[PDB]
Design a protein around this ligand. Structure first.
Ligand SMILES: COc1ccccc1[C@@H](O)CN1C[C@@H](C(N)=O)CC1=O
Ligand SMILES: [Zn+2]
Length: 140
């Protein structure tokens, strides 16, 4: 589990969204595994606006932050899980690292701010849903 809290927005994995998220929906995209809902309180996270390929992510199944090298956002084939069939997921970045299903939501960050959230995993790989192209998270 986990979310990004920027401005009056809450960014979560679409497959982990709650009823309150769906009832206060701003935007959702199944192909990216992302959903954004509105919040009453202002958040403290800042979004990175860069092309970094190195950063640090939080792994809840280890209680640890790991430094990682990650690929550029791309269209990657992801195996079937309990939330999606086997399919292509867009705007996804891969790294070598530990991930279990419940690690979804952990933040990946670089020197500029938040880069994305854990979205996929298995066999020593971890995939992150990028949010750096979502410029509207910084306003309105
Ligand atoms: C953190 O991901 C894992 C870690 C270890 C093993 C398996 C997984 C993934 O199958 C977990 N996922 C990925 C999500 C997606 N975006 O397709 C849906 C889902 O249930
Ligand atoms: Zn950066």
């Amino acid at each position: 589990s986990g979310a990004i809290y920027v401005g009056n927005y809450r960014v979560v994995n679409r497959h982990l969204a709650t009823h309150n998220d769906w009832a206060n929906l701003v935007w959702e995209d199944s192909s990216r595994d992302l959903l954004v809902s509105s919040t009453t309180a202002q958040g403290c996270d800042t979004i990175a606006r860069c092309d970094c390929q190195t950063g640090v992510y939080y792994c809840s199944s280890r209680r640890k932050h790991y430094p990682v090298s990650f690929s550029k956002p791309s269209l990657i084939f992801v195996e079937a899980s309990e939330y999606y069939p086997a399919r292509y997921q867009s705007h996804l970045m891969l790294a070598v690292g530990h991930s279990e299903p419940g690690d979804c939501g952990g933040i990946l960050r670089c020197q500029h701010g938040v880069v994305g959230i854990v979205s996929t995993g298995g066999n020593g790989l971890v995939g992150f849903a990028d949010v750096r192209d979502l410029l509207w998270l910084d306003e309105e």
